[PDB]
Structures are given as structure tokens and as C-alpha cells.
Nucleic acid binder design. Structure first.
Ligand SMILES: [Cl-]
Ligand SMILES: [Cl-]
Ligand SMILES: [Cl-]
Ligand SMILES: [Cl-]
Ligand SMILES: [K+]
Ligand SMILES: [Mg+2]
Ligand SMILES: [Mg+2]
Ligand SMILES: [Mg+2]
Ligand SMILES: [Mg+2]
Ligand SMILES: [Mg+2]
Ligand SMILES: [Mg+2]
Ligand SMILES: [Mg+2]
Ligand SMILES: [Mg+2]
Ligand SMILES: [Mg+2]
Ligand SMILES: [Mg+2]
Ligand SMILES: [Mg+2]
Ligand SMILES: [Mg+2]
Ligand SMILES: [Mg+2]
Ligand SMILES: [Mg+2]
Ligand SMILES: [Mg+2]
Ligand SMILES: [Mg+2]
Ligand SMILES: [Mg+2]
Ligand SMILES: [Mg+2]
Ligand code: NA
Ligand code: NA
Ligand code: NA
Ligand code: NA
Ligand code: NA
Ligand code: NA
Ligand code: NA
Ligand code: NA
Ligand SMILES: [Sr+2]
Ligand SMILES: [Sr+2]
Ligand SMILES: [Sr+2]
Ligand SMILES: [Sr+2]
Ligand SMILES: [Sr+2]
Ligand SMILES: [Sr+2]
Ligand SMILES: [Sr+2]
Ligand SMILES: [Sr+2]
Ligand SMILES: [Sr+2]
Ligand SMILES: [Sr+2]
Ligand SMILES: [Sr+2]
Ligand SMILES: [Sr+2]
Ligand SMILES: [Sr+2]
Ligand SMILES: [Sr+2]
Ligand SMILES: [Sr+2]
Ligand SMILES: [Sr+2]
Lengths: 237, 92, 194, 56
RNA sequence: GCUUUACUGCAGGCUGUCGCUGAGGACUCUCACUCCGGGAGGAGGACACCGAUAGCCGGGCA
RNA sequence: ACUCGUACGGUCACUGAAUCCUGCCCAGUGCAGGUAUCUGAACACCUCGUACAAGAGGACGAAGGACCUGUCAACGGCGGG
RNA sequence: AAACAUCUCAGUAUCGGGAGGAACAGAAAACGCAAUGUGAUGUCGUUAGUAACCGCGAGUGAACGCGAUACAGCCCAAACC
């Protein structure tokens, strides 16, 4: 047959690319030698096209002006700190080791110094649970207990823009506008609605997959469609 | 059908009638060193392997007698045409 | 008595034992960080180099080249093929890696001509060979009784036509009798069946 | 809108132009590659054995 | 052209084994190698990646 | 490529606004998990064979299968008496 | 091959790289008319559709030698300096 849409994606052609030339900045934590003698002032709150959430522009002591992944409750004028000795307040960054247990955090690094990988989406947060000299235990937004190096840096508080998901798009046109700001091909044509040549589910008088949807993990690209390695399906049981 | 385990008949070796013992021919084990075995290895590779990609044929509803006739005095055996027989049980 | 050279030779018969073993373990760390073709002031295996024609003289160059290990890196058929011509994974190329190495080296030094080459080991993902190249335009060589032959016009780009020792071996030209019916005088003249 | 006559009216783009190297009007001014001699693509001149019958 | 529990194969995924690969049926270590870090250094570690091969799945493809 | 993205994410599918609802079936097929025992290739190992080698057999046994379990808003099914 | 998968078409078409006036080969770790024999290498005639291969099907297919053409044999590495 013909390659399915999932396969066209990988080629990274314009249709499937993200509007990167329009994206603002990479919100990675600052790199500090040590001492925490790094503080800056929030000079402005901006809209981040890539995340549909707000970001804050900060002017640091040493003259560096950079955008930062802002938690909820940060405003212009406010002073932020980044370092081992940073103060324990919303909007401040410091290694998990310095963070008191039971404190919601965001933009958590996976490997100390990577700039932040976890909990960066609208209104989300990781929950610092356990401390130690060898391992910091964090509860990520998905509910998973993640063991991290206590040297992994993070920002106190939850990500701004929470609740974004609580309101329905209502119109196709609204989805449309959001989609234009992401690396995604939209709208979506169902596999069952295509010709046999275009998808495993295509073909047949009436629409219906002519096979079970739960596909094996070992299936090759082009065939891995539907419910991938489902451990179960439905709502029952 | 029934078959006598031993009986008097012609032994082409002694060249005279003598008692023979009848036995079903047991398959001899292969060595894997015949020419055909070497050709299979040489000609099998990537993709279809011609004759070496074919698999075991079928079965006739009934098979023919497959027996050995052993002379009771010179100890040598001879073979004979077989005849279709659903079953072949020896007597004694 | 034994030449000092024989000791280098003898060391390399078992590159995985003795001091040579520790040298390789050390060196390869540096080699893995070098480029595809690195010129070197002196041969790592002197005995072999001199044996292959090397000389400490102007116009003589040595370069270490690395190549990825394994079989062919081929793309599966996009058009119809019979089972036989659908193979992709176990199909290997007809030129050995040493030959590929000699060619890359010669491309890097367009004006030089490949004289010979030898192996200097490998790790799990690549192989290294050192190649001796000669400057056919330098008088120190145009006047050398043992190397001036490589200055002739018909020796130009010799490596690309399989005129190298590795080239000739790879073309099945070693045997002068049985087995060379389709290799001599050329693979091509014999319909490419060797 | 038909693919024929009505769609021919929209054609006013300049693509292939006289090539600096070979003189043929085959230099694609958008690709900056000559479809006839290969200029802009290769130093060597564009050539193929299929441009003639196999045994000639 | 299309389909599939048609025939025969081919990609691909899983898995064992051999090489890369080191020291003291379960284990410690560091030196290759990998990853994080601007750097110091940190994490991991003879595994993983990669080469070779074996078994299984394999209309994704011929 | 996704991705200047990180689960309030984005990938793969099905249904197709709101409203009231969405029953029974895990035997077969699919997916996933488990698995005492059974089955399960190659290398190495052991026996036989060969002054060697081919080869025959053995022991060990991964995934997989047998077997067990979960799962239908998974393929689908919901009859005759 | 009266289908077709090994095989065939064929190392052909076509593609990448490269030299010359011609290329390439070439002074035996050869041959093995087994010899008290030949003596670098191309090529031509023959050996021969022979040996060999092959769903042992269709088809594929040499060599040594011999008669010719032309003939030509040398240089390093190391030992010792
Ligand atoms: Cl969305
Ligand atoms: Cl019988
Ligand atoms: Cl060259
Ligand atoms: Cl002779
Ligand atoms: K064919
Ligand atoms: Mg960022
Ligand atoms: Mg878009
Ligand atoms: Mg749709
Ligand atoms: Mg339709
Ligand atoms: Mg239709
Ligand atoms: Mg399909
Ligand atoms: Mg439907
Ligand atoms: Mg001399
Ligand atoms: Mg010729
Ligand atoms: Mg990196
Ligand atoms: Mg098909
Ligand atoms: Mg519908
Ligand atoms: Mg509809
Ligand atoms: Mg035919
Ligand atoms: Mg062939
Ligand atoms: Mg036939
Ligand atoms: Mg042929
Ligand atoms: Mg011969
Ligand atoms: Na063969
Ligand atoms: Na060159
Ligand atoms: Na061959
Ligand atoms: Na069921
Ligand atoms: Na025919
Ligand atoms: Na046909
Ligand atoms: Na055949
Ligand atoms: Na004679
Ligand atoms: Sr980043
Ligand atoms: Sr970075
Ligand atoms: Sr369908
Ligand atoms: Sr239910
Ligand atoms: Sr073969
Ligand atoms: Sr095969
Ligand atoms: Sr039958
Ligand atoms: Sr050239
Ligand atoms: Sr229209
Ligand atoms: Sr019109
Ligand atoms: Sr126009
Ligand atoms: Sr170009
Ligand atoms: Sr050309
Ligand atoms: Sr509805
Ligand atoms: Sr089931
Ligand atoms: Sr002569």
C-alpha cells in the first residue's frame, strides 16, 4: 500500500514541523558557579506560543536578561533567586536537596544541570516527598514516584496557567488556532474512513476495522496502529 | 493381515530352500554427509531455495509390506516386492 | 642477529597480548577522537611500513584511516524483486575495508599515490589502517631508484583501479594457477564472474 | 476549474532560463541548476548512457 | 491495484550467544564505553550502544 | 521530525454537539501479565565417532508456545430446542 | 523454464570512481599430458559444449595441454655494514 500518516510525520516536512521560527525561548534554569549570589528582577510577563502559558522575563544582577518558566503568582518587580542558598519562596530555583519536603515544585531537572525536564506544562507540579543524601523522591504529575539525584534543580511552586484545560474549545476554529502553534497535523481523519491502501483499517463496504485494534509492541511501523500494546481496553472490569 | 514370523522358502544366497525369519524394515539413521546434504547447504541462502524450500509430501491410504527375509542358516537377508496391507501382524 | 624491526613485527603477531595490548587500549582512546584520515609523522608499525616500501624521505607520507566495521550499508529494494534479490541484511560488499580505507586516504591527498597499507587494529565498531602515500612530483622521489616507478603517468590514481597490493589480492589475483581462471588478467575481461 | 485551458492562464512564472555554461534554456532560475548540462549541480558535465541506444 | 490464518521470502521488533570487554548462579569494583555538566566534576558501567549470529513474531513490504 | 515540547504533555486509535443512557458474553481471535511443570535455537560444555574434521547423541534453556489470569467504548457475538 | 519461487535473461541495461594511447596481467608458495616432463603474462586457433554445475528441469560451462603470435627479465624488506 502507501505509507500511513504516522510514517509521513517522521520525515519532518513543513506540514509536520513546529513553528519554531516563531517560538520565543528555551526556559532552562540558569547556570551558576555556586554561592547562589544570583538574583534578578521580573521585568515583564509574556505569552509563550509553544505552551499556551505565561513566561516571565527576568533581569539578573550580572546583566543577563532571560525568559524563565514562571510558576503561578509571579509578577513584575518581584525578585527571584537561583542557587544553593536561594530563599524558599515561590519562583525561586535551587537543588532538590535544599528544598524542604512536602513542597510543590516545577521544571524539575532529570540530570543535574540539564535545565529542567519535568512538570513544565500549564498549572502542573511535582511534589517533593522524600529527602536523603543519595536520592530525592519526587511525585510527578502523572502520579509516578521518581527517584532523582538530590542535586537536580527545580523551581518552587506550580506552573502558571492552571485550569486551561477546564474550558472546552467549543469550536473547530479554536482548535485550529491552537494547532497552528504546534508541530501537529490537524484535523484528524479516522483510519476506518480511508481506503485499504492508506491504512490497516481502511476499506470495506461499511466502516469498521477488519481486525482487532490491540497491536503488538513488536509490530513494524506502518502496522503499529490502533491500541498499542494495550494492557487492557474499555472501561469495565 | 497375519504373517508367519518364520517359514520355509527360497534363499537366493544358499540357492536352496531354508527357514527364514521375517522382520519389518527399520529405518536406518542418516549421517548428514551424503552429497544431497552438502548441496542443501551450498544452495540454500537468502530468499527461496528452490527444491530445498519444498516440504514433505502426503501419504497413500495404505502402504506396501516393507519386509526383510533372513535365511536361517547363512544368516543373510533378501528383499521382495511388497503388497498393500492395512496392517501386518506376525504370528509368534 | 635479529633486527630491532623483528621485535615490532613479533609484537604485532599478538596485538592482544603483552605491552602492545596496553598500548592499543591507550591509543585507541585518542584515535576514536581523531578524524577519518589523520596524517602521522611516523608509521605505528615500522617493520611493516619499511617492508611495504616505506622510507624516511621527502615525498613519503603516512596516514591513519578509520572505517566503520561490519557488512554493507544497503537500502532495501523500492521496486519489485524476486526473493533472491530482496536480501538486505546479510549482503556484504565486494571490496574489503582496507581497500575502502586506501581510497579515502588517497582522496584526502589528491596529489599523492597509494603505495601500500596495513592494519593497525580495530575495536568493536571500526577498523584502522595506515596508508603509505608517495609524492610523484617531488624530486627526492623522482630520483629514488626504489620508488621512482610510481611517478609514471599510468600509475596515476592507481588505488582507484585496484592496482594496490590489497587491490590485487581482493581481485583474486594471488593464485597463478587453479582458481584464477576468472580473475586474471582482470575481473572485467572475464565477464565479472570472479 | 478545469485542469486544462483555464488552468493554463495562471502560468507566468519564469523557471528555466539560458544556461551560462551550456547555452541551453535549461538553467532553472529557482533551483539554480541546469537540467541539461548539470551546471550548479556538478563540476562534471551531465551525461547518461541512456541518451542513446544501448549498443550505440 | 487491493486482501488475508494462500505459497515463498524480505524489512522491522523481541530474545540468547560471540566480539567491543577490564579488575577483584549470585556479587563487588573501575579503566574502556555511554550519558549529564561551561568546567571541575557527577551519573552509569563492563551493561548499554554498535558489528555478527541464532530462535520467535512479522501483508509493514516484495 | 515530534521538540525553544514534558502528562493541564503528545503520540495511536474509535465514537461524533447538548440531553437521557450505554445491558449480557473473555469460548475463538487480538493485546497484556504470570507461569511449578512441559516444549523451546545457536555458541560454549560433556559422550560417541574421526590420529583431526564432517556427523550422531547429551546436558543447560532465552524470548515464544503449552497452561493460568486480566481485558469488549478489543475484533466481534447475543441462536436452535 | 510454455505457470513459477532455485535457475534463466546477466554480471547484461543502467549508475558511481579512475587511467592510457592502448588498458589490465606478468617472472610460480605455478603446472600435475605424474614425468628422467613443462617453465612469467596477454591474446588467437583448438582442447569442448568436453570436465563441472543444475526444480539433475530449462539451461549454465571452464582448465591443464597443444599449434600460433610476441617474447625479457628484474627491483625491494632483512641478514652484514
Ligand atoms: Cl489540544
Ligand atoms: Cl510392513
Ligand atoms: Cl592512488
Ligand atoms: Cl606440461
Ligand atoms: K526473474
Ligand atoms: Mg526552555
Ligand atoms: Mg501547522
Ligand atoms: Mg476524525
Ligand atoms: Mg471512501
Ligand atoms: Mg470506495
Ligand atoms: Mg493495508
Ligand atoms: Mg463504525
Ligand atoms: Mg640497491
Ligand atoms: Mg585484456
Ligand atoms: Mg550529548
Ligand atoms: Mg502482496
Ligand atoms: Mg461514524
Ligand atoms: Mg459521519
Ligand atoms: Mg515463464
Ligand atoms: Mg546467478
Ligand atoms: Mg518444468
Ligand atoms: Mg553464466
Ligand atoms: Mg588445470
Ligand atoms: Na555453491
Ligand atoms: Na590521491
Ligand atoms: Na566467484
Ligand atoms: Na473471548
Ligand atoms: Na511461458
Ligand atoms: Na504468469
Ligand atoms: Na538450479
Ligand atoms: Na603433447
Ligand atoms: Sr531543553
Ligand atoms: Sr542546554
Ligand atoms: Sr475496513
Ligand atoms: Sr461493561
Ligand atoms: Sr553458496
Ligand atoms: Sr533461504
Ligand atoms: Sr492421501
Ligand atoms: Sr585524477
Ligand atoms: Sr473544489
Ligand atoms: Sr473558466
Ligand atoms: Sr502565476
Ligand atoms: Sr549544488
Ligand atoms: Sr555520465
Ligand atoms: Sr451525544
Ligand atoms: Sr481472550
Ligand atoms: Sr619466453
Amino acid at each position: 500500500g502507501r505509507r500511513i500518516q504516522g510514517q509521513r510525520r517522521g520525515r519532518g516536512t513543513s506540514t509536520f514541523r513546529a513553528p519554531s521560527h516563531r517560538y520565543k525561548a528555551d526556559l532552562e534554569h540558569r547556570k551558576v558557579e555556586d554561592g547562589d549570589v544570583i538574583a534578578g528582577t521580573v521585568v515583564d510577563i509574556e505569552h509563550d506560543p509553544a505552551r499556551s502559558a505565561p513566561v516571565a522575563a527576568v533581569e539578573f544582577e550580572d546583566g543577563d536578561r532571560r525568559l524563565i518558566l514562571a510558576p503561578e503568582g509571579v509578577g513584575v518587580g518581584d525578585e527571584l533567586q537561583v542557587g544553593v542558598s536561594a530563599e524558599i519562596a515561590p519562583g525561586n530555583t535551587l537543588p532538590l536537596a535544599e528544598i524542604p519536603e512536602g513542597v510543590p515544585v516545577c521544571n524539575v531537572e532529570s540530570s543535574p544541570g540539564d535545565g529542567g525536564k519535568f512538570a513544565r506544562a500549564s498549572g502542573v507540579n511535582a511534589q517533593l516527598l522524600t529527602h536523603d543524601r543519595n536520592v530525592a523522591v519526587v511525585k510527578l504529575p502523572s502520579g509516578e514516584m521518581k527517584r532523582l539525584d538530590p542535586q537536580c534543580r527545580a523551581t518552587i511552586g506550580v506552573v502558571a496557567g492552571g485550569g486551561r484545560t477546564d474550558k472546552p474549545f467549543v469550536k473547530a476554529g479554536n482548535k485550529h488556532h491552537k494547532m497552528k502553534a504546534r508541530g501537529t497535523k490537524w484535523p484528524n481523519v479516522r483510519g476506518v474512513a480511508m481506503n485499504a491502501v492508506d491504512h490497516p483499517f481502511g476499506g470495506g463496504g461499511r466502516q469498521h476495522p477488519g481486525k482487532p485494534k490491540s497491536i503488538s509492541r513488536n509490530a513494524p511501523p506502518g502496522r503499529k496502529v490502533g491500541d498499542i500494546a494495550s494492557k487492557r481496553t474499555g472501561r469495565g472490569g | 493381515m497375519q504373517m508367519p514370523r518364520r517359514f520355509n522358502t527360497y534363499c537366493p544366497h544358499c540357492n536352496e530352500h531354508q527357514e527364514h525369519e521375517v522382520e519389518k524394515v527399520r529405518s536406518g539413521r542418516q549421517t548428514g554427509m551424503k552429497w544431497i546434504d552438502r548441496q542443501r547447504e551450498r544452495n540454500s541462502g537468502i530468499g527461496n531455495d528452490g527444491k530445498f524450500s519444498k516440504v514433505p509430501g502426503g501419504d497413500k491410504p495404505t502402504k506396501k509390506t516393507d519386509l526383510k527375509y533372513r535365511c536361517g542358516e547363512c544368516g543373510k537377508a533378501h528383499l521382495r516386492e511388497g503388497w498393500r496391507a492395512g496392517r501386518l501382524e506376525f504370528q509368534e | 642477529a635479529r633486527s630491532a624491526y623483528s621485535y615490532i613485527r613479533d609484537a604485532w603477531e599478538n596485538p592482544g597480548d603483552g605491552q602492545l595490548a596496553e598500548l592499543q587500549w591507550q591509543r585507541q582512546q585518542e584515535w576514536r577522537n581523531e578524524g577519518a584520515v589523520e596524517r602521522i609523522e611516523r608509521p605505528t608499525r615500522l617493520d611493516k611500513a619499511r617492508s611495504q616500501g616505506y622510507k624516511a624521505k621527502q615525498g613519503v607520507i603516512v596516514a591513519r584511516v578509520s572505517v566503520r566495521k561490519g557488512s554493507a550499508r544497503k537500502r532495501r529494494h523500492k521496486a519489485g524483486r524476486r526473493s533472491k534479490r530482496q536480501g538486505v541484511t546479510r549482503i556484504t560488499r565486494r571490496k574489503d575495508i582496507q581497500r575502502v580505507a586506501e581510497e579515502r586516504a588517497s582522496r584526502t591527498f589528491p596529489n599523492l599515490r597509494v603505495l601500500n597499507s596495513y592494519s593497525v587494529g580495530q575495536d568493536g565498531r571500526q577498523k584502522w589502517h595506515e596508508v603509505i602515500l608517495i609524492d610523484p612530483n617531488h624530486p627526492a622521489i623522482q630520483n629514488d631508484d626504489d620508488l621512482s616507478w610510481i611517478c609514471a603517468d599510468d600509475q596515476a590514481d592507481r588505488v582507484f583501479r585496484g592496482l594496490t597490493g590489497a587491490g590485487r589480492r581482493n581481485r583474486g589475483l594471488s593464485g597463478k594457477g587453479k582458481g584464477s581462471e576468472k580473475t586474471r588478467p582482470s575481473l572485467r575481461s572475464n565477464g565479472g564472474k570472479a | 476549474t478545469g485542469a486544462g485551458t483555464p488552468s493554463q492562464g495562471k502560468k507566468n512564472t519564469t523557471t528555466h532560463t539560458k544556461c551560462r555554461r551550456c547555452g541551453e534554456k535549461s538553467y532553472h532560475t529557482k533551483k539554480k541548476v541546469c537540467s541539461s548540462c548539470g551546471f550548479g549541480k556538478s563540476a562534471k558535465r551531465r551525461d547518461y548512457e541512456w541518451q542513446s541506444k544501448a549498443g550505440e
